[PDB]
Symmetry: C5
Subunit: 259 residues, 5 copies
């Protein structure tokens, strides 16, 4: 497709604003935003995580004003994690730091990820352990082999459904995603402190080196996120993933395209 001129004027511009809720597993009616407590398999062969123990990628497909050639072009993003201060609840059934101490805060491995695209985020499967049996209700790499532990090119998918694609199975496919801008950080380690910044003064530019942002096919914008903040440790010592919602504000402009 040939990318031509940007439309100017009052109605040449639109704005998308929303939040994506985390999908941590939600083990019961009181635990939205948490996973089930983590259990450990005896062997690699017997790894069989339940669905409510697996955080999943979040995704929203957002319909844009009909243009039917013109396409909406995503230009700028403002984003942040919503509710960062909730992690200061150090008094709610947590394991004490020491005798008489406060509760341990959420900490340990985190994955913070967001993307803005003109089509679904394209995924590549990579498995820590190829013999893991993934549960019904999840979408996971099929026909896994030992090579799936490093790179098996069969594991291609689209992030096209909520509560479905487990975080541990899937990453953005760097061989694809031409029409998406993605950003992520895994911070591993059992004792890693959450470091969460909030401000309404920071913008991310979504244009590539040619001045072109994601172009929204069929007038749909795709927003994806993961914000696993770390693990909450309850009084018994059991640990659950804790996630938070992510705010998105995307500025878009009309762009003429040919063919």
């Amino acid at each position: 497709v040939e990318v031509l001129e940007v439309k100017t004027g009052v109605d040449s511009i639109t704005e998308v604003e929303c939040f994506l809720t985390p999908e941590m597993g939600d083990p019961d009616e009181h635990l939205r935003g948490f996973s089930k407590s983590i259990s450990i398999s005896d062997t690699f062969e017997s790894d069989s995580p339940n669905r409510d123990m697996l955080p999943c990628y979040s995704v929203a497909r957002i319909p844009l004003p009909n243009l039917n050639i013109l396409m909406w072009e995503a230009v700028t993003l403002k984003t942040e994690v919503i509710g960062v201060t909730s992690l200061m609840n150090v008094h709610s059934n947590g394991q004490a730091t020491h005798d008489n101490g406060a509760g341990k805060p959420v900490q340990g491995t985190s994955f913070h990820f967001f993307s803005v695209g003109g089509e679904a985020l394209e995924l590549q499967g990579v498995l820590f352990n190829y013999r893991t049996k993934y549960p019904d209700g999840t979408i996971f790499p099929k026909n896994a082999t030992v090579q799936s532990q490093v790179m098996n090119t069969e594991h291609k998918a689209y992030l096209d459904k909520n509560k479905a694609y487990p975080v541990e199975c899937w990453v953005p496919d760097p061989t694809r995603n031409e029409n998406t801008r993605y950003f992520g950080t895994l911070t591993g380690g059992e004792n890693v402190p959450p470091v969460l910044h909030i401000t309404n003064t920071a913008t991310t530019v979504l244009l590539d080196e040619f001045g072109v942002g994601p172009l929204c096919k069929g007038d749909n914008l795709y927003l994806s996120a993961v914000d696993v903040c770390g693990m909450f440790t309850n009084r018994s010592g059991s640990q659950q993933w804790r996630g938070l919602s992510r705010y998105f504000k995307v500025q878009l402009r009309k762009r003429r395209v040919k063919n």
Copy 2:
């Protein structure tokens, strides 16, 4: 409101300078700056923190010289935490690092936050545990549901009162706050070290991408802050939040609007 030209001349500028004290809970007459010692509930459902155990957002509404259309526009900010060196008192009823050692310093989860606006900071409620029973004298998310643990759009508030809005319940609402600039960092983790920088040489510009700063409605400037530095651990092992004051210096100019 349409934003027009900035007024010039000697009388077209003003300066606001002040300290905002922390509101950590102040459990007795000797413990200003501290919270009550932290207790842990045995279940999520029984979480019922006492008021003096909950740090709150600080806020000051500052009257500006009367203009009564001209509005005061906040342009720059100098800010820092005041009393950073007090955290070196490692000899005062603290739990020793090890046998014969010095007292443990203030450490662990911190939240450092400041905002400057031409109206009250707008808040969105998010709850770690939606069944937490928040105490009388605090203002908290009402009609909480399990969805409040991730996002419930009913929980909207204004930071319009001191010693009232618990830090753990509320964040700046990213869907609002057009007329405020806010900045915050949460550093979690039980053993996290305070890293506190001071200088009189650093300035934050409050103008947006169109060159407009917060515009002060009714000639009032709103300053908000949280500076939970971490926890102090006493000899028994009990832990209390410790907070410090924040200095604000704001430069403002007169701006015509229509």
Copy 3:
């Protein structure tokens, strides 16, 4: 060689895109991407690591479109580690963080390295302990002496074979590698947390101060990588290196040279 003008026009550019799989040791048919469990010799004298306990440098030689004097010049690189989220599998035969806790994540010493060159990466040998007996099937510093522990200029090699050059024996030779650009970070320490960033928005420019990138001799591009992410600790406490694949995308252009 005298470097002259760059060729222009649509056909003057080409792109290489591939992944390099990690070579961590692969101790059995199920453990691709892992090393063998780490054992410790009683003395420096008795240090004799298994082949499957030693991570190696990865390399790929990529043939480019035939030119002939013109040479392909590597200008830009996009690169990232593939499968960062796999390290969130904290439920598979791991040692618990504490009683009832989740499994320990991959952590500890890491080496992340990549290079792009117009010829094989040039290596210099440096040994932690010169008395280490390196195993059959590996290529290692020969005629080692006590000076090999700091600098022995005899230890020169080319990274010209996979599953061969152990990471711990070899580094890029800074006295050579004129025609390669290399980047690496060793983060040492038992409890170091992996910090892995992913994005499709970041480019590294490969041109030197004179504006000249690697020039591909015989129309071959050389890509090299190491991504030792840390160690996985199983239920017994034994530890194995865990590695991940690395994506490369290289933009090249035709450059005229003389002699």
Copy 4:
């Protein structure tokens, strides 16, 4: 009113010096160290001895006699003797059985300022009931509000070995004629991270291009470099401090009224 800069060869001068730390110096052998830290039983009974309390360092440096005033334009600065912290073999508590001595580590405060007059201080107390010892200058008439902000506690850094670090900070409402920079890194296990180089310069000019102006032809340099604590074999801990190098370039500036 601040007018033009004087040019020519003698319109420029340089000040170079070392500021020694004032950590408490508990005996004739322990310069640079505090007394071992003792912990009070309660807040009420907190009564630190003088030699256990690090203080701010200050030097007033006379400039060439000169309305013209010397204007401080640039600063080069670093901690001197960073490598001494590698003495891990001198009466230290072992890291573990048969291990080396523990290095200096834990809470640090690194601070420096350059001004045309004494650094202005604001008092803030961790515990308002702390009894500060004779020989120190501390916040007077302390109340519970002193634990957060009591504006009565104003002072000038005008004496060495006198103003305890834990009691005092630069007063942000004042210090118009000073540039100050500091970092507190708290936490019992914090590692010292100390950079040295003769290639780094700090510009002291404000946004209007004016540096500190030296009243009475005197330049004020202040510092704190508490590097952390040294743990001896018994487990007792003392603050260890190091000297700070200052190189300040000054130029002659004409001023009115």
Copy 5:
């Protein structure tokens, strides 16, 4: 001396490339790159480290092409050589935990390099002035208690290899006009080595007037310390481990008056 124009032309430029080996103590014929295991004295007064327990500064003086013209050092590429050797976690190390891999090299590090047209000038500072430094080392003489903070008598030149202990000496900031130095001490018993390698990074050696070190007598002085941390053996005893440093220096001919 007044600094004039840079000479141009093909032969007006030269390059120096070399490696400086670390001098960690080398306690026996198998332990080049290591110090002797660290022993701890009972008291400050009894501190008496053996020579092979003390890492020293490394120095090389490199002769340049014979030339008033002076060679001027303009740029530096440098890195630590053999960073991957620290991945040997299988050779007589102390296990991190039961059944685990050996502990890697970690704890206090000092990484330092300088480039000058004359010997690096040193200032002495002692952790403990009563330390008895061993024969074969060059150390601050006539030490007093003031040597623990600043004794201006302690002046030296880094003019000998395996001689000047790292812990005794630092670059003298009141001198070194004709040298550019850079160093980082990262203390702490468990500090992780973070070691970056690349052939794409250059340090410019010119001062604010655009003048680099000028090589007196046509000699270039390179100095380094790369104590990477401590290696812990099975018994728990710890030894410093160091690595070599690569230097590549570009120089140009500069005319100088008198």
